[PDB]
Each structure stands twice: as structure tokens, then as C-alpha cells.
């Protein structure tokens, strides 16, 4: 979603406050990653 | 479908490696460790009470890992790959059952956790153990990673299997001058101890043992050893007639001139020269002063009570130095493997662990002692929680040890360092490739000649291909592809069993026995030397091969040195092979259909007596076949296949037997340095450095080795068509050259991944280090330098990032390190922000980032940056056959030929490599390649095996290519026929580390180092390059004055010293200081390294007072 | 702090681009510096009791498995406590126990006084009163105030069971929070309402456990 | 060689040890935190 | 990771053929070259990549972030 990011294992959209904690909610599993930006991005294939 | 008697064997090796894994060495010995050893370890010290508390004891009972009696395997534990990201140690709790004493009638016990154990992947206790492909998936880590490596603090490493000189055996080194030292070094638990003995002066021969003082006459010794005859002494060590009698007897002569018998003086003179007893418990000072330790000093191998045993042990030992002193040769040279032993990680963790645990509990005495000091109330509350405050120092100390590599063991009084390496993933082959490695150490100086080269005895029980160019201070060696490192079995049952064969004891021996048979040696320890050498070997081997003492505990003879050695020492190199039973193999070729059927398995051949593991010494006795085709009824065994002789990396070279071996060496050193898929976990793992390849391909040639490890599922390289030719004189020497509109088509492309973690920790002022970011001035945009993100204030996925930008914004308090006070009001900011900046020549991408926590509950951010590299000019390209070369000047398209169907070669390569490097193996491989595609198959090749050449001819001609493997091509430029037929076709290539874009390094004016005030070190940080002395003086042969100055001065350290004619010394600005004038100074320029050296001197008392004089007026 | 000799710009920009790694201001074009010169690679009654005090401090600290960093807080506090002569008059375990407790409390972590103290013979009211004294002797403020919202976690981690507890935890917290809202919370041990909502929402998730286990 | 400059064979045993100038006793980067990486000789003489 | 749409030599379009190839191997098991030969592959450099290029994406989709 256009909200922030995702778990590692549970793999679900999740946001966070500022200075709160990194533990996910859906899962008690700690580590998690950041979703790819909704912002445009460009290469040139060659 | 009956099977070839040759080709059937080929299914053994896989089934051998199927059940029992390729890397078991660590795996077993780690499992064998965690399972058996500790239950013995604590069984050593289970009992502690300090000197206090008349009724107390603390009795250890059980050690477990994962089982507190909830489940069998640990009920739950962290997943290893997940831990690789949490950057923790990856460990398992230590469940320990202990019965203690606390208070009136208690004697109570539980399970306890003293700490955690840094387990090893794919062990028994590992989660990965017997987990099928979904637990790989759901647990997010590769199936094909062999494991067998630890992981701690986010890194992993390995315990490198280190070879140690064979211990507790009599060995004679024959050296000129000297007099040919005999040495035997033995260890049991306590006191690993060296011992030496040798002549000093002219037949007068003494013991050097650092225990005793030095130089003890051996005849006196053997007297004290309990044999008083002085006759059967000589007769014993000597022989019957020959000349050996007097050759030894000189000592016996000047032995007699001192003293006699063994009441006091034999034992006493030993204790007379023995070192101190260390104060207390000196009362053993006696006529038996050393008599206790007279026998036991460095001869623990036997000890016991009466003196005859080791007495004769010393005797036979003396036999080797007299047979030595007779002549050179006729001795032993520390070389051939059996006299050396690798020793597995299993016992490494054993020793290190149990000694940390040891000193631990030793200090746990004190841990209860502070409680025990003042008898507050009645003192009990047995320190059950009090272990915890003392605890995990084992675990911690074990962690920092196992990753760090410094092992200090002061109970063994010996220290090894660099015991581990950072685990190597540059490639898939390296994975098992950095495993299956062996370290050599010690061996006197590094210049010492003997322990250097590759000796023949090494055959098939190590690798003979790989000895990488990193030779240096020591040596690495690699195993075979069929290896069994032996576990130490047992002593007494096989001993008394030897007696069951009807052997005899030293007690029953005549003490005339340098004539009888040969000898029997258990651990290399003489017992009876039973009569009838041969049938003895027959019977016992028959036990081994049939019912008992499997693995090793084998046997081999020696006719010259008269012995039959049969000891049960583990850590010993082994290997299977096929017994020929009388006339021919025990296999009988039908039993293998009973194998390939799927119900046979392995270890049966042992218990059904077909094949077994053997020793270099054993096979030194045996006589081995090669092909069942070519055998003798007088033979003993055949090894199933040759090509287990190659090493784990060497198995890649197609048809190596057609090369010259150094190119195989270089080929191994390159193979692990290739680049490939790593593992299925690929994009889910983040490592400090990574490479990969966009479109890897199975090499058109296979080696059935590859089929073992499924290396075809993980190729590193391209299968690339080439035309051997000197075309495009940019080629010249070894320098390959490539094809655009191929590189354009995706040939040989590499995603290059890196990671930069930034730890986020709180500081005693209790203000976190902060990620704050997103400035966005300018009305709607953050400045370019700061435009590298989004509102989060941290890097994000899918962005080109040009160097100078921020791929993490890390704001730390500039007051964070200050001393906090019991006050605060408003601003706890004061941030000096140090966001790290991507630096480098060419844009990379952030496609993945991780915010996560470590164990201490702190914010930890880890990002991975990547850039793909089109294979630009100047890239190392291995031809996988030993051709190690740079990509030359990239051709466009039309240039370089095309021919009939228009197939254009990709790599285009110089012929001249092939003549002098003299490797035709590749030259065959190309044939096999053009073949396989045309029949539509992969193409086997293997050492002394695979597809042969001649068949391909018909294979090719039918489909219309010249059987010679050659064809016409047409001028890439001119468009006419090429004036000589060209050999071209498919070959598997690969791309390496040392990509130029990494490596190209330059500066204009770069940083200077504070101490010497001059350019910094090497690449990375920043530049500067090395004019060494040996490099420098080359300019002097041209005698260039100024080139030195501009080079070693004006561009090096630009400085002006100010000095004083009167009393030349170096002032500053306008003063001469110690003579304070501020007048007589002269300003001049000098290398700052010079003035440095001066003050460095004049720091120390010295005065290189610089007197000066004019340049001009003559 | 430094200013250009000519343009006199107050802001300097560092150029790491070409790997000159120099410093010059957008106001002049005249560099600040060339090649920033960088680097690479006793016995006192107080100081000795600071050695031993670190020994005790760290050891008993992570006997709880508390974060190493947090320990240095108390180390200053302990050192700060040396200044006012609050340290000498009574036992050491009181001291270190106190200064660690003021850290973890002030730093709002999950650990409990009655618990933490229980590492010893101690009545736990003793060292409680010790901590109470340095409230006078040191000078502090509202800093150390906690709630079960923390401690349910450390409790929840200790009971194993299944992961529904987390779902239960969310259920429990607001539960207790409403109990905190309904004003029955203050004036009582927070652990009580903690284990309460434990048994309640675990009861809501119908897993049968014992009060022994809860109070454990 | 004596001619009233250095000081005849007396000097060669220490009396006043000159402190090595500070630049040749470079204090290593404080490298974050409060504890700065020391430099050795200054530790030596500072014990002297 | 997935068969390059064009070879490294001819650069004739490979992409269509892989699926049709792989199916043509599984369905109606038949000799490799001949398959390609009656699939329309002649040039051996064109051919190697169908005889080769172990697919890593299918062995990857075992692992995926999302599941
Ligand atoms: Zn989750
Ligand atoms: Zn002067
Ligand atoms: Zn300026
Ligand atoms: Zn093609």
C-alpha cells in the first residue's frame, strides 16, 4: 500500500510512528524491510 | 540390465557421499561433540566445594542442549538465516542438570541454563537438520548451502580444519652436525609435553627434557627404567652380531665409570638434577625423590607402576637412533601424511569450551566464597541464581573467541591464533571450497625445506591440484572427494583382543627380541611382538573387514624397521576402495545391481566385507589396482575410481589429465574466485560484499563431480563461443577480447551487491542517535545532495544514487558523549549529524533496506547498495581451463568473423597461450562443446574419463562440421575467406573478482597521515602509491637528480625547516629555541620525513646538528 | 568557525568528489585546507572500588540480561553516589542495586524491583529503602514512573504458550487500560493487574492455566 | 671529541629525558565516545 | 535467471522457444537436439542456451519476501 512498509516473515503492510519500536504487530517477529517507493523511477536499457 | 564391471563402480561414490555427507568432518565431530564429549567433560569435574562449610557439595550430572524435557529437539530457537540479519550470535541454550547442597537434608537438583552454545549449521541440534525444502522456504535459507559453519555477531566464518604434527609417537629426525635428534611428544589431558633425546658429543648421548634440567646419560636412564642387567640393555637396543654392538656400547662404557644399579642413584641422580617441586609438597624429595615422576614426565603414554613397560619403550626408541647413527637414510622424514594428522573442529570446541568451563567453575568456588565469607545467619541459599551472575561468560568468552580467532589456553600452555577465517562467499565453489581446507603450522622456520612441496604419498587422500598462490607463512591443503577422518575408537578391548590372537606380553618376553618376528605397536606402543607376522595381519584384518573395529584400527607392516603397527588414533585420513578377494574383487559385479536397485545402501560393504577405509601406512603395506580391467592375482585392492583424487575445486577442470598441472593449480585458485548464483536464498540475504551473474549456464562439459554437488544447478560463468585466433592485434598476450551486440545482448553481466550497516545506540546522556532527515528547502524539493530519499528520512528502494548523496541520514547528538546530570529542561538535541555518503565512480541502486533491532534493544539500520557492471574493458576473464586474462579492446560487431550460418564468436582468443602454457585439455573441451549441442547433450568429462575424442569425429561430420573441430570463417572486416582454417566453438568461461572499476585508483592531492604527514595507505580510504627502495633505486641507474626531488620531495612532503647556523637545530617560525636569538636562522626546504627522523632521534639523546653553508659563491 | 581570507564566507563546503577531499566555500573558490590530515588504526581507594564496582556492576547487571549500555548509566550514578557519601554507610548490594534500579526506571525498561532485588537473601524492602534514601541524597524528579504496559511483555515472553498471546496481549493491554481508566489501577502493584488481564484474555482465548503460573 | 660543546662522557647516562614533541606523539583519533585511543610512548613516560 | 530473450551470438529471439521447448520436452519426451531441430533451432550458439540456462527463478520463487 501507499503506507510505509512490510514485515520480514509475516509480510504485511505496516506503518510506524516516530521513535516507537521496530517490532511488527501481525507477528512478534522483529526484523522487517521497507516497501519500494510509490515514486517514479527510470533506467535506460542498453 | 547388467552393468559394466567398470561403470558400476561409479554409483558407489555418490551413495557413499549420499548418506554420509561431503562435509561431515565438522558436522559429525560437532555432533559427536555436543552429544558425547560433554557428558564426559563434566564427568571429569562434577564436584566442587570450597574449603569451608563442613557439609556441602555441588554435583554436576547432566548436560543437554535444547532438551529441558519439553520436546526432544529444542522446543523453539531463533532461525539461523533470520539471525544473520539480526546480526546476533546464533546459539542454543545449555541445559544442565546439577545436584547441589544448600541446607538441612536437601541435596536438590534441577535443569539450569549456564549459557548458550554457538551451534553449527546443519548439525544434529541445528534447526536445518533433516528439513525438507519448505522449512528451507518457510525458514528462508538455502537448501544447497552445505552448512557446517558457525554464525556470530552477524558474521559467520568457519573453524578451519588445522593439521597438527602427529602426536605421541617416537620420531627420529636425522640432521647433519647435530647427531640426529629423536623426539616424541605426547599428551593426555593435562600436560601436553615435548621431549627430546640425542647425542651431544661423539657417541655420548643424552636426554634433553625441559622438565629435567638437561643432558642425562641414557644408560643411567634405562637403568633407572628398571632394567638393571646392563647386558640385555646392550643386547636389547643392539641386535645379535653385526657391528651394532659397540656402535651403541660407548655410552655403556662411560656409563659404568660413574655409578651402578638402581636403589637411589639411578632414580636419584635424575631427581638430583630435577627442577624444584614448587615449595610445598616437596616431601617427595627422597631417595625416590623423582621416582614418582621419574617414570612420568614426558612418558605418560604408559606410566602405570612397574618400570619395564616404558623402559622398553625407551629401548626401542633408542634402537632407531642407533640404527640411524649407523647410516644416514634409514630414518624418518617429517613429510608423508601418516606421520602428520589433521584434527577436526570437534575437539577444538571441546578443549576451548571445557577449559573456559574449567576456569569458570574454578572461579565459581570464589563465586560462592564471597557469600561464604561471613557466616551471615546460616549460609545456604546455594548459589542457584548466583551461577547466572557468573554465567554466560562461558558463552560470551566463547563467542568472542570463536569469531576472533585468538585461542589462549593456559592450561595447555599453548596459544594458536588465526584459527578461523571470515567465511568466503565470493562464489558457489568457494563455499565448500573454503571448507575442505587444511592449515599447516609450526615446523621450525618457514625456510625449512622438508615441510614444503607436494609429496607422492599424498595420493588420493588429499587434493593434489590446489595450493593457491597465498603460500606464505604456512600452507593450505585440500581433501579428496572421498575422505573419512577417523574418530578415536578405543584401546583396551583391541589390546586384550590382540592377546586373544595369542600375542605375548613384555613380561613374558626373553628380552632377547630384536630377532623375533617384527613388532606390535598399539598407538605406536610396543606390547609383545607376537610370532608369525603375516597370519596375524590376516586374522585381524578379517575381524575388521567383517565383524569389528570398523573404520580404521586397520594394520600395516614394516619389514625394515621390524614392527606391525596397529593403533587406534583418530583424526586419521581414510578413504574407501575395493578389496580384490584373492583373484579379483569382492564386489563380484552382480552385487551392484543389488545396489543400484535402491535397497542396499552403504556401510554394508564394511559389514558384508567388500570395501573399507584405509591408511597411507596401511596402503603402504597393501598393493592397489587401478582398473578391474588390469589386475594381478597377487593384488590386494582397487580404488573404485581415480577421480576422487582431484579436489573439491579441481573437479571442475574438464579432462585435467590433458593439461600441465600448474594450470590446474591456477585453475583452482581462479575457480573459487569466479562469480555465480551463490544460493537460492540469494536476494533474501545481505552480506558485506557480494557478486553474482545475470545469466549463468551449465558448462557444456560436465565433470561427474559437478553432478555430485549439483554445481550444474549453480553455475558460475557463461557458456561462450570463441574462436582461437590472433585477430585484433589488441589481443597479444593472454588478453581476451569481446563482442558488442552480445555484451549488448546480455553476455556476462553482473549485479554487484554491497551492504553498509549503521549501528544505532543510545548514549549515557540517554539520547538516541537519530535518523532525522527530509530537509526540503527551495519550496517542494530537498537539495540535490540531500535528495536521496522520502519522508521517512532514510534510503528507499529503486533509486539511482550519485556519489555525494545520502543513503542514510544519521543524526547523533554532539552532546551524546557528555556527562549527564540529574537535570534536563528542553533541548536534548545538539546534533552533529554524520549521514554517510555513497562514494564511488558510478551510480548504484538502493533496492532493499532493513530497520531492525539487535539483542540489546537498540535501533539498527542496514542498507544494501547495488550496481550492475557491463563488462567494460580490462576485466579478468578466466577460461576455466587455466587461462587468466584481461578483456581486450571490445570489438563492435562486424569485425571478428561470422561464417556460414553467421554464428559470430563472442570471446576471441590468442593461440599463443596454448603452446607455452601447454594445455590441450581446453582444446579438447571445445570439440566436446561443439559436439554436445549438435547431438543435443551435455558432455561428460572427468579425470581419466568422460567422453573420449574419436567418437566426436563421426558425431560432428554427420552433421557437417570438420571432425578436426575446425572451420573456415570470413574476415570481420574484409569479407573474404580466412587464409587458414580456424578452430572455434563452445567453451565455458567465467567472470572474476578484481573488476577494474573497483580496482582503478587515482588521486591528485589526497589526505596525509598525521604521524608521517604524507599520502595514505593503498586503495579505499584514499590514494598514494608506493615507491619502495628496491623500486626507487631503479631511477638512480638513470641518475636523474630532479626526478628524485619532484618525486621524493616536492610532491611528497613539502616542508621548510628553520634552523640556526650556530648550533644547528630545528626551530619554528622565527626562533632557534634552545639558543634563543631569533636572528641566525636560515629558512630552507627539507623532506618532512627528515625533520621527523630528527626529532625522533633528538627525542632520544643524540644530536645530528645540521651545519649549513651556501649554495652559491662556489 | 573558520572564515575565508577573501570572500569571508561563514560556511565551508567539503569536496570529496575527485578524492582531493578538500574544503572550500561557495563564496570564494579559495580552499580552506589541503589534504585534511587524518589518523588511522591507577591504584586509588576510589579507583580500585571503581574497578571492583564495574566488576560487580556489570556482572550482576546482565545476570538479568539487561543491555550493556544501560549499565553505564548507573556507573555514573554509582560514581555520582560516591560524591555525596551516600555509598559508604551501608551494604554494596544496596548501592549497585539502587543505581541500576534508578537507571532502568529512569530509562523505562521492563524489570521489577521485588524481582531484581530477589537475586539475594534480601527482604527487598531493605534495598527498597536504600533506593528511597538516595531520593533524598541525590536530587531527582518525576523521571521513574512505569506501568504494566511494559511488564506484560517480559511476562508474556516468559510463559511461552502460543503466539495468540500477542493477540491476547493487545486484548489485555486496553483491557487493563480501561481498568486503568475505571480507576482501580493506582495504589496497587501493577503486576497484579498485569497477570489479571493475562488470565482474563487468555481466558478469553480459553487456555487453561494456573494462578501459580501467573504469579510465577 | 671534547671542546666544550656537548659535555664530555657524562651525558651518555640519562638525567633529563626530553619529552618527545607532541606531533611525534600523535594522539590517536578520539574515535567517538569519551575514551580516546591512547598513544603508547606517552603512556610509557607518563608512567616514568 | 530467465532465458535471455536473444542469444549471445545470433541474438535470434529465444524467449518464445523456452516455454514451448520445456513443454515439448516434458509433454512428448523426445531427443533434445531433434526437438530444437524440429522446434526450429539450427545454429548451435543459438542452441546452447536452450540446452543450457538452468532456470533460477522457479527455484527462487520457493523463496519470496511476500509468500
Ligand atoms: Zn508480523
Ligand atoms: Zn642555533
Ligand atoms: Zn572563503
Ligand atoms: Zn545463435
Amino acid at each position: 500500500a501507499t503506507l510505509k512498509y512490510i514485515c520480514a516473515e509475516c509480510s504485511s503492510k505496516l506503518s510506524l510512528s516516530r521513535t516507537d519500536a521496530v517490532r511488527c504487530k501481525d507477528c512478534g517477529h522483529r526484523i522487517l524491510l521497507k516497501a519500494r517507493t510509490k515514486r517514479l523511477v527510470q533506467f535506460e536499457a542498453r | 540390465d547388467e552393468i559394466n564391471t567398470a561403470q558400476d563402480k561409479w554409483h558407489l561414490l555418490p551413495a557413499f557421499l549420499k548418506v554420509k555427507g561431503l562435509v561431515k568432518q565438522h558436522l559429525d565431530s560437532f555432533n559427536y561433540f555436543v552429544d558425547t564429549d560433554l557428558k564426559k567433560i563434566i564427568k571429569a569435574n562434577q564436584l566442587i566445594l570450597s574449603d569451608v562449610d563442613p557439609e556441602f557439595y555441588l554435583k554436576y550430572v547432566d548436560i543437554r542442549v535444547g532438551k529441558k524435557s519439553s520436546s526432544s529437539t529444542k522446543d523453539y530457537l531463533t532461525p539461523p538465516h533470520e539471525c544473520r540479519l539480526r546480526d546476533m550470535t546464533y546459539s542454543a541454550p545449555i541445559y544442565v542438570d546439577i545436584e547441589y547442597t544448600r541446607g538441612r537434608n536437601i541435596i536438590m537438583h534441577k535443569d539450569v541454563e549456564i549459557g548458550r552454545m554457538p551451534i553449527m549449521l546443519r548439525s544434529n541440534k541445528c534447526i536445518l537438520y533433516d528439513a525438507d525444502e519448505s522449512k528451507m522456504a518457510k525458514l528462508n535459507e538455502c537448501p544447497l548451502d552445505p552448512g557446517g559453519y558457525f554464525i556470530v555477531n552477524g558474521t559467520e566464518k568457519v573453524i578451519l580444519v588445522q593439521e597438527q604434527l602427529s602426536k605421541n609417537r617416537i620420531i627420529v629426525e636425522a640432521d647433519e652436525k647435530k647427531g640426529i635428534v629423536q623426539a616424541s611428544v605426547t599428551s593426555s589431558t593435562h600436560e601436553r609435553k615435548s621431549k627430546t633425546y640425542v647425542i651431544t658429543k661423539n657417541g655420548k648421548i643424552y636426554l634433553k627434557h625441559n622438565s629435567i634440567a638437561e643432558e642425562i646419560p641414557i644408560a643411567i636412564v634405562l637403568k633407572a627404567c628398571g632394567i638393571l642387567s646392563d647386558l640385555e640393555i646392550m643386547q636389547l637396543v643392539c641386535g645379535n652380531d653385526s657391528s651394532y654392538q659397540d656402535i651403541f656400547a660407548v655410552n655403556l662404557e662411560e656409563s659404568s665409570k660413574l655409578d651402578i644399579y638402581t636403589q637411589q642413584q639411578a632414580l636419584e641422580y635424575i631427581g638430583a638434577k630435577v627442577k624444584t617441586m614448587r615449595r610445598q609438597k616437596l616431601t617427595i624429595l627422597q631417595e625416590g625423590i623423582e621416582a614418582i615422576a621419574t617414570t612420568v614426565i614426558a612418558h605418560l603414554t604408559v606410566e602405570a607402576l612397574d618400570f619395564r613397560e616404558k623402559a622398553l619403550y625407551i629401548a626401542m626408541m633408542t634402537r632407531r637412533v642407533v640404527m640411524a647413527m649407523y647410516n644416514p637414510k634409514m630414518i624418518d622424514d617429517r613429510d608423508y601424511v601418516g606421520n602428520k594428522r589433521l584434527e577436526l573442529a570437534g575437539q577444538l570446541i571441546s578443549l576451548l569450551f571445557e577449559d573456559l568451563f574449567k576456569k569458570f567453575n574454578n572461579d565459581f568456588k570464589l563465586s560462592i566464597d564471597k557469600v561464604l565469607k561471613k557466616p551471615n545467619r546460616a549460609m545456604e541459599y546455594d548459589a542457584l541464581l548466583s551461577i547466572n551472575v557468573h554465567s554466560n561468560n562461558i558463552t560470551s568468552g566463547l563467542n568472542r573467541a570463536i569469531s576472533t580467532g585468538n585461542w589462549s589456553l593456559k592450561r595447555f600452555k599453548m596459544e594458536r591464533a588465526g584459527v578461523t577465517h571470515v567465511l568466503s562467499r565470493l562464489s558457489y565453489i568457494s563455499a565448500l571450497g573454503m571448507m575442505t581446507r587444511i592449515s599447516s603450522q609450526f615446523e621450525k622456520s618457514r625456510k625449512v625445506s622438508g615441510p614444503r612441496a607436494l609429496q607422492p604419498s599424498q595420493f588420493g587422500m588429499l587434493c593434489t591440484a590446489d595450493t593457491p598462490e597465498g603460500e606464505a607463512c604456512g600452507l593450505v591443503k585440500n581433501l579428496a572427494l572421498m575422505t573419512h577422518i577417523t574418530t578415536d575408537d578405543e584401546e583396551e578391548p583391541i589390546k586384550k583382543l590382540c592377546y586373544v590372537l595369542g600375542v605375548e606380553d613384555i613380561t613374558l618376553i626373553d628380552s632377547a627380541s630384536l630377532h623375533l618376528n617384527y613388532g606390535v605397536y598399539l598407538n605406536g606402543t610396543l606390547i609383545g611382538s607376537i610370532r608369525f607376522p603375516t597370519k596375524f595381519v590376516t586374522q585381524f584384518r578379517h575381524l575388521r573387514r567383517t565383524g569389528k573395529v570398523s573404520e580404521f584400527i586397520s594394520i600395516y607392516s614394516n619389514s625394515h624397521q621390524m614392527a606391525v603397527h596397529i593403533a587406534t588414533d583418530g583424526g586419521r585420513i581414510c578413504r574407501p576402495l575395493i578389496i580384490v578377494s584373492d583373484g579379483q574383487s569382492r564386489v563380484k559385479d552382480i552385487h551392484l545391481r543389488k545396489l543400484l536397485d535402491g535397497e542396499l545402501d552403504f556401510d554394508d560393504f564394511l559389514k558384508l566385507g567388500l570395501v573399507e577405509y584405509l591408511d597411507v601406512n596401511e596402503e603402504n603395506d597393501s598393493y592397489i589396482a587401478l582398473y578391474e580391467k588390469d589386475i594381478v592375482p597377487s593384488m590386494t585392492h582397487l580404488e573404485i575410481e581415480p577421480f576422487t583424487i582431484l579436489g573439491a575445486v579441481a573437479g571442475l577442470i574438464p579432462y585435467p589429465h590433458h593439461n600441465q598441472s600448474p594450470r590446474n593449480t591456477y585453475q583452482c585458485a581462479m575457480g573459487k574466485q569466479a562469480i555465480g548464483a551463490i544460493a537460492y536464498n540469494q536476494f533474501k540475504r545481505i552480506d558485506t560484499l557480494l557478486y553474482l551473474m545475470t545469466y549463468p549456464q551449465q558448462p557444456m562439459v560436465k565433470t561427474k563431480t559437478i553432478e555430485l554437488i549439483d554445481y550444474d544447478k549453480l553455475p558460475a560463468g557463461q557458456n561462450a563461443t570463441v574462436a582461437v585466433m590472433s585477430y585484433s592485434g589488441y589481443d597479444i598476450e593472454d588478453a581476451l577480447v569481446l563482442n558488442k551486440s552480445s555484451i549488448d545482448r546480455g553476455f556476462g553481466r553482473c549485479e554487484t551487491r554491497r551492504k553498509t550497516t549503521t549501528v544505532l545506540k543510545r548514549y549515557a546522556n540517554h539520547t538516541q542517535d537519530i535518523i532525522g532527515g527530509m530537509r526540503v528547502d527551495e519550496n517542494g524539493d530537498p537539495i540535490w545532495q540531500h535528495q536521496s530519499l522520502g519522508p521517512d528520512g532514510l534510503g528507499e528502494v529503486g533509486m539511482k544514487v550519485q556519489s555525494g548523496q545520502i543513503y542514510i541520514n544519521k543524526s547523533v547528538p554532539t552532546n551524546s558523549a557528555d556527562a549527564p546530570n540529574p537535570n534536563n529542561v528542553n533541548v536534548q538535541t545538539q546534533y552533529r549529524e554524520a549521514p554517510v555518503i555513497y562514494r564511488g565512480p558510478e551510480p548504484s541502486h538502493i533496492d532493499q533496506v532493513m530497520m531492525s533491532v539487535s539483542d540489546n534493544d537498540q535501533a539498527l539500520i542496514k542498507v544494501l547498495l547495488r550496481q550492475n557492471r557491463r563488462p567494460e574493458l580490462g576485466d579478468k576473464f578466466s577460461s576455466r581451463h587455466g587461462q587468466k586474462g584481461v578483456c581486450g579492446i571490445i570489438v563492435k560487431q562486424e569485425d571478428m568473423p561470422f561464417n556460414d550460418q553467421g554464428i559470430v564468436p563472442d570471446i576471441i582468443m590468442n593461440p599463443h597461450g596454448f603452446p607455452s602454457r601447454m594445455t590441450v585439455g581446453k582444446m579438447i573441451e571445445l570439440i566436446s562443446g561443439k559436439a554436445g549441442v549438435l547431438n543435443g547433450t551435455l558432455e561428460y568429462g572427468t579425470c581419466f574419463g568422460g567422453s573420449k575424442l574419436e567418437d566426436m569425429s563421426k558425431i560432428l561430420v554427420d552433421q557437417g562440421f570438420n571432425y578436426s573441430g575446425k572451420d573456415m570463417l570470413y574476415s570481420g572486416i574484409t569479407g573474404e575467406c580466412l587464409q587458414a582454417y580456424i578452430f572455434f566453438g563452445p567453451i565455458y568461461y567465467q567472470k572474476l573478482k578484481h573488476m577494474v572499476l573497483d580496482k582503478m585508483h587515482a588521486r591528485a592531492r589526497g589526505p596525509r597521515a598525521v604521524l608521517t604527514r604524507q599520502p595514505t595507505e593503498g586503495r579505499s580510504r584514499d590514494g598514494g602509491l608506493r615507491l619502495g627502495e628496491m623500486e626507487r633505486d631503479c631511477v638512480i641507474a638513470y641518475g636523474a637528480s630532479q626526478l628524485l626531488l619532484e618525486r621524493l620531495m616536492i610532491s611528497s612532503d613539502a616542508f621548510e625547516v628553520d634552523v640556526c647556523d650556530k648550533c644547528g637545530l630545528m626551530g619554528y617560525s622565527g626562533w632557534c629555541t634552545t639558543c634563543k636569538s631569533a636572528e641566525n636562522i636560515i629558512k630552507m626546504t627539507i623532506p618532512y620525513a627528515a625533520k621527523l627522523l630528527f626529532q625522533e632521534l633528538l627525542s632520544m639523546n643524540i644530536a645530528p646538528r645540521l651545519r649549513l653553508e651556501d649554495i652559491f659563491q662556489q | 568557525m573558520p572564515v575565508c581570507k577573501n570572500c569571508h564566507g561563514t560556511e565551508f563546503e567539503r569536496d570529496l568528489s575527485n578524492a582531493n577531499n578538500d574544503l572550500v566555500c561557495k563564496a570564494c573558490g579559495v580552499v580552506s585546507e589541503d589534504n585534511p590530515i587524518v589518523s588511522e588504526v591507577a591504584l586509588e581507594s576510589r579507583e580500585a572500588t571503581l574497578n571492583n564496582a564495574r566488576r560487580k556492576l556489570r556482572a550482576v547487571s546482565y545476570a538479568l540480561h539487561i543491555p550493556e549500555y544501560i549499565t553505564d548509566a548507573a556507573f555514573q550514578w554509582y560514581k555520582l553516589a560516591l560524591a555525596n557519601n551516600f555509598v559508604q554507610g551501608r551494604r554494596s548490594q544496596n548501592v549497585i542495586a539502587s543505581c541500576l534500579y534508578v537507571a532502568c526506571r529512569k530509562e523505562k525498561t521492563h524489570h521489577m524491583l521485588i524481582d531484581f532485588s530477589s537475586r539475594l537473601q534480601v527482604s527487598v524492602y531493605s534495598i527498597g529503602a536504600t533506593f528511597l534514601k538516595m531520593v533524598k541524597k541525590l536530587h531527582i524528579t518525576e523521571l521513574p514512573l512505569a506501568d504494566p504496559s511494559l511488564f506484560i511483555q517480559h511476562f508474556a515472553e516468559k510463559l511461552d504458550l502460543a503466539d495468540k498471546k500477542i493477540k491476547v496481549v493487545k486484548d489485555a493491554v486496553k483491557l487493563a487500560q480501561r481498568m486503568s481508566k475505571d480507576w482501580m489501577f493506582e495504589g496497587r502493584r501493577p503486576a497484579g493487574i498485569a497477570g489479571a488481564c493475562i488470565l482474563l484474555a487468555c481466558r478469553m482465548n480459553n487456555l487453561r492455566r494456573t494462578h501459580t503460573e501467573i504469579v510465577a | 671529541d671534547a671542546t666544550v660543546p656537548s659535555g664530555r662522557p657524562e651525558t651518555y647516562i640519562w638525567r633529563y629525558l626530553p619529552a618527545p614533541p607532541v606531533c611525534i606523539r600523535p594522539s590517536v583519533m578520539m574515535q567517538d565516545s569519551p575514551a580516546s585511543n591512547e598513544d603508547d610512548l606517552t603512556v610509557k613516560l607518563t608512567e616514568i | 535467471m530467465i532465458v535471455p530473450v536473444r542469444c549471445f551470438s545470433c541474438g535470434k529471439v529465444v524467449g518464445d522457444k523456452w516455454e514451448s521447448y520445456l513443454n515439448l520436452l516434458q509433454e512428448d519426451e523426445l531427443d533434445e537436439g531433434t526437438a530444437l531441430s524440429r522446434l526450429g533451432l539450427k545454429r548451435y550458439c543459438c542452441r546452447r542456451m536452450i540446452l543450457t540456462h538452468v532456470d533460477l527463478i522457479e527455484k527462487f520463487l520457493r523463496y519470496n519476501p511476500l509468500e
Side-chain angles (χ1 to χ4, degrees), chain C residues 62-76:
Chain C
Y62 65 86
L64 299 172
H65 299 84
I66 62 172
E68 177 274 335
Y69 157 73
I70 298 171
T71 62
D72 287 345
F75 174 78
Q76 184 171 353

Side-chain angles (χ1 to χ4, degrees), chain B residues 486-516:
Chain B
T486 298
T487 58
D488 61 356
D489 180 70
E490 188 65 15
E491 183 276 336
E492 180 63 15
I494 191 67
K495 179 180 170 62
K496 58 175 63 180
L497 174 61
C498 186
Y499 290 96
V500 174
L501 200 147
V503 307
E504 65 281 9
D505 187 8
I506 184 173
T507 60
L508 275 70
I509 292 174
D510 189 13
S511 296
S513 315
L514 188 147
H515 66 285
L516 74 83

